[PDB]
Design a protein around this ligand. Sequence first.
Ligand SMILES: Cc1cc2nc3c(=O)[nH]c(=O)nc-3n(C[C@H](O)[C@H](O)[C@H](O)COP(=O)(O)OP(=O)(O)OC[C@H]3O[C@@H](n4cnc5c(N)ncnc54)[C@H](O)[C@@H]3O)c2cc1C
Length: 499
Amino acid sequence: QSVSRAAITAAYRRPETEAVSMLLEQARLPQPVAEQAHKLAYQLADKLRNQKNASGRAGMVQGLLQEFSLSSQEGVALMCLAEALLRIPDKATRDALIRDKILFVNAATWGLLFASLSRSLNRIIGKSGEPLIRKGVDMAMRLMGEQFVTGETIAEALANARKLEEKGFRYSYDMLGEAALTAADAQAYMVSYQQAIHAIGKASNGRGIYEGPGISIKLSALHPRYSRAQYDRVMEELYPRLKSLTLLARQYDIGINIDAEESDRLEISLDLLEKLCFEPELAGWNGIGFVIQAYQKRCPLVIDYLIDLATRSRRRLMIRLVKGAYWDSEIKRAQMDGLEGYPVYTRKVYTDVSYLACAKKLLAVPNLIYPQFATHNAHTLAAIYQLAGQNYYPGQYEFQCLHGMGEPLYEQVTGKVADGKLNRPCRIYAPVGTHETLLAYLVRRLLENGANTSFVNRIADTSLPLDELVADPVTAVEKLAQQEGQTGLPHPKIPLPRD
Ligand SMILES: Cc1cc2nc3c(=O)[nH]c(=O)nc-3n(C[C@H](O)[C@H](O)[C@H](O)COP(=O)(O)OP(=O)(O)OC[C@H]3O[C@@H](n4cnc5c(N)ncnc54)[C@H](O)[C@@H]3O)c2cc1C
């Protein structure tokens, strides 16, 4: 192996105390930068919560719960009567009714300001069995998944693009579907990607890899049983498909991004990337993109490799820095394999520290990397904004977000300074497909949105103060270290696989 490739392999399951300790000073924001990041993060998160005055309304709510010593159930019932009184048209009649003599339709809506279904479930199940369960799972998947899908076909998705593109947003389209099980499956995904590139490229119409739309691909869709595939078959079979798609993207001058999937496929994906970057037909073209996952211990070492690869292959790589979408499966996988450790961190704050350290590394080499900072986290965003320094220029970096998750945060970000925005571009990741391709993506979105460690989950918890929500991760790790006795201890509820 090369020097940088060898270092990747060595860090695979590095002990967490060691990995976190090494990243801390790389992630630490200088005090004035940290202060500016905090104020911006606080401001972004405040406007998120208090959209339609959610906090101020909740304030007046509890203020009346106190002054009368009323319950919360006593609060709703009072508003319901108050609402019915405000529907009496003439004030003299309303006043006279209140004085001389003194319904719950919208009681549910008022309660938002403040057991037998189990029987119905046990009854319905035994009667109708697994077919009812299977249809209910398919149905709930489609209902919950709709908010995350931009269109059923690439033509439909593309037809919706101008609305946000004219506001300064960009797109990366994802043809849903992954983990091809058969040769026919992988061939169908290949044809779907080719069709999509033709459509996106014609719509891009020469706007180029920065301003114009691009595509995101999953290597697992292009090779049957990719999860266990050997190097020889992957190079023989998957790589010609990857090359073919990338040459076509180059012909239309659109970005083509290689998504990151499970951690045991990182190595083969670097082998594919290495070969791709030296294709003569791609010389002098900078549209190749690659995702790296900050929750992996290998991430900073992958960056050193990518920096060297951009230098040797004489290109600027588009690098999407993410935290990562497969954490729950990574933990379970590692516990089943009984190895010396985990390839990912076990405390969420460590992943945040890793992301900040990795972001600094990426921003230091603008000639070699175009960083694409994917996050829905207001502190992460504000930190990157400050770390990128003074004198932003559009080609310095961009943000990215997922369709159906990013809008309220990035509405404050993309657009004119005169309109109160930060004037930084954001590329929306846009899944395209029908219900038959949605399951795996939807599940990952449920895990993301439902975890009590996720920013998008914590910002919806109005009992968590804004200052705790946007707390600096480096300081959080040092507070843990002072309490627990050393830096970077694993999650107490996630022991090592061999324990
Ligand atoms: C446009 C875009 C493209 C993306 N592409 C990919 C991709 O190709 N591959 C991929 O794997 N991910 C990808 N992601 C990331 C993934 O889908 C999540 O959106 C992302 O990790 C959420 O980070 P956040 O900063 O918005 O949330 P935050 O809430 O600040 O962080 C949440 C993340 O922390 C991590 N985490 C949660 N619990 C723990 C824990 N106990 N210990 C350690 N870490 C923890 C997980 O990565 C989780 O997603 C992409 C994200 C976006 C926005």
